[PDB]
């Protein structure tokens, strides 16, 4: 069953499973901590179960930020009301020696597995940088006298990670919805620590660096993120055909980008210009503001419902919104708000100045 996250590119193209394993793949600064704090903000309050945040080898400043922001959110309650808390934190952050970072994911699961097995309920496990589990075993493995494997990792990378990931599952007694950030080293998705993790996940959300340099946030690669929930018997045929149609015009636009760079858009067929016009529009429409990114972007964040996501991208595929400019789709919630933003863009191009005086800038009043 689907996990509605309120994120447009997630809920459309790679939708999350409610008891499944979710991986956010990232390359150092592309946005997989902002995305994982947004899922804590959107999913983990309407979930109604316990959460475990295992911080494995990430910043200690971020551990203090989440801990303090959970106290003012009432997710963590201090003092005599501690039992009304919904989250427990396990932290093995990046100042720890490599033995502590190699095992702190295991003690985060043990807290999550008790709520699944004994308490019998639904847990949310958020593991920030499960790559650091693999990297900490790789710092150790040199000194355990092992012949190193490919790029320089442990010979036991797949079974070390496999033995940990196979514990993070939904069983017949309880559920664990697991969101894990996966760092990719030197932006290399063929690196064996990202490449081994891909098989362990029901939904992989791959965040790209080139998508982030075009200002699109969340920097989700729409043609590299994948769910097993994108299946017409699971999400319905109306949802499925929009996601596959969105991916089809984004792929055919990617096939054009070699010519658009050299020859320009003047050499395109006008059948192909309608592709580039539409695929530039949905590329901006996949971005959205986050309620955790408003504190540094200024823009308030928009939770977009699944029905507003599907109908909005279906309109851009059929052609109902070819009127609007491509910057009206950028950082807006749903298709009601691109029309709200296109009206503002048109209005501004007319009214820009004539603020000389008789405002509050009088030198005596």
């Amino acid at each position: 069953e689907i996990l509605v996250t309120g994120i447009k590119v997630v809920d459309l193209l790679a939708p999350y499973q409610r008891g499944g394993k979710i991986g956010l793949f990232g390359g150092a600064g592309v946005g997989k901590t902002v995305l994982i704090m947004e899922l804590i903000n959107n999913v983990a309050k309407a979930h109604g179960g316990f959460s475990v945040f295992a911080g494995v080898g990430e910043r200690t400043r971020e551990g203090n930020d989440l801990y303090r922001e959970m106290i003012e959110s009432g997710v963590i309650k201090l003092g005599a009301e501690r039992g009304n808390s919904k989250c427990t934190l396990v932290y093995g952050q990046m100042n720890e020696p490599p033995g502590a970072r190699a095992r702190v994911a295991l003690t985060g699961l043990t807290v999550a597995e008790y709520f699944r097995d004994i308490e019998g309920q639904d847990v949310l496990l958020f593991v920030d940088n499960i790559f650091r589990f693999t990297q900490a075993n790789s710092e150790v493995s040199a000194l355990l006298g092992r012949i190193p494997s490919a790029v320089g990792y442990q010979p036991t990378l797949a079974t070390d990670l496999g033995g940990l990931q196979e514990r993070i599952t939904t069983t017949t007694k309880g559920s664990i919805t697991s969101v894990q950030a996966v760092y990719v080293p030197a932006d290399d998705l063929t690196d064996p620590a990202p490449a081994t993790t891909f098989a362990h996940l029901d939904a992989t959300t791959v965040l790209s660096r080139s998508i982030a340099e075009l200002g699109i946030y969340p920097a989700v690669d729409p043609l590299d993120s994948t769910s097993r929930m994108l299946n017409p018997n699971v999400i319905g045929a109306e949802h499925y055909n929009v996601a596959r149609g969105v991916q089809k015009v984004l792929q055919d636009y990617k096939n054009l980008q070699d010519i658009i760079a050299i020859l320009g858009m003047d050499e395109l067929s006008e059948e192909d210009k309608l592709t580039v016009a539409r695929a530039r529009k949905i590329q901006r429409f996949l971005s959205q503001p986050f309620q955790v990114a408003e504190v540094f972007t200024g823009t308030p964040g928009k939770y977009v419902d699944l029905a507003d996501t599907i109908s909005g991208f279906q309109g851009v595929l059929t052609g109902k919104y070819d009127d609007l400019p491509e910057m009206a789709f950028y950082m807006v919630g749903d298709i009601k708000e691109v029309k709200e933003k296109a009206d503002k863009m048109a209005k501004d191009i007319a009214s820009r100045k004539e603020a000389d005086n008789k405002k509050v800038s009088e030198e005596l009043k």
Partner: protein, 277 residues
């Protein structure tokens, strides 16, 4: 995957020499067609001081001709006058008139159908293949007088320099279907001239505006052809930069992969040696 990046440097280096050849192919074709576009500029001058220049007339029937290129590495030249077509084809209709849209050049039928397909009736192509001559521009004009409108509209790019191509609307009124009807204010502007023709003044103006049609058509597809070579030259300059900027990013990417596979093969060799020693 170190041969896929090496065969892309094969592609972009051949493109960046194709597009620099087409830059100077179009540059030499811009200069030997400038010696034909300046000689042809003279003959359009007497007909615009004899008949004037009246773009916005309320014609009953019009033939609008947007003369474009045949080959299409021009860089948005054939689209700017298709854009300037409907900018004048919506402007001059104040009464719901007939309009026959004509295109000279094979890149015109593919773009005028996108705006007016119900008024598009003629397609002249293969014009610039050998050269542009006045007898050829006469035959194009005689096919335009089979339909007889009250006015003609010729839409072309005036080759001003190698940089600027300001488009022109050149208008030709039919001989007394509107032409003398626009001069005759408190008398006539045409009655100053003593007609030395064989037959009537209304009959020499029938001869004189077909000749005014064929002249400003011959200039149009000669101004446009020299404007096409000078926009292909600016287009094939912008693509050798784009194929040099892409080649530079590929060579940085290739040197990074070249350094990385030398480190990778060496770590494989030392690991196999340390397992034996």
């Amino acid at each position: 995957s170190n041969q896929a990046v090496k065969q892309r440097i094969r592609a972009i280096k051949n493109i960046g020499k194709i597009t620099k050849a087409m830059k100077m192919v179009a540059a030499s074709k811009m200069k030997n067609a400038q010696i034909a576009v300046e000689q042809s500029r003279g003959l359009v001058d007497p007909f615009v001081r004899l008949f004037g220049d009246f773009p916005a007339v309320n014609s009953n029937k019009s033939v609008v001709v947007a003369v474009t290129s045949d080959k299409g590495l021009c860089g948005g030249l054939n689209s700017n006058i298709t854009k300037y077509t409907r900018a004048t084809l919506a402007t001059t209709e104040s009464e719901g008139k007939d309009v026959v849209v004509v295109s000279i050049g094979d890149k015109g039928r593919s773009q005028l159908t996108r705006i007016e397909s119900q008024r598009y009736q003629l397609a002249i192509a293969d014009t610039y293949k050998v050269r542009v001559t006045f007898g050829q521009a006469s035959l194009i004009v005689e096919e335009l007088i089979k339909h007889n409108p009250q006015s003609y509209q010729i839409l072309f790019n005036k080759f001003r320099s190698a940089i600027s191509f300001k488009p022109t609307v050149a208008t030709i009124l039919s001989p007394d279907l509107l032409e003398k009807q626009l001069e005759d204010v408190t008398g006539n502007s045409l009655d100053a001239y003593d007609i030395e023709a064989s037959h009537e003044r209304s009959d020499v103006l029938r001869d004189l505006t077909e000749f005014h049609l064929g002249v400003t058509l011959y200039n149009a597809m000669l101004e446009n052809n020299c404007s096409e070579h000078a926009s292909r030259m600016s287009a094939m300059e912008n693509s050798t930069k784009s194929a040099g900027e892409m080649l530079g990013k590929l060579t940085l990417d290739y040197n990074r992969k070249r350094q990385a596979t030398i480190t990778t093969e060496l770590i494989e060799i030392i690991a196999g040696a340390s397992a034996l020693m």
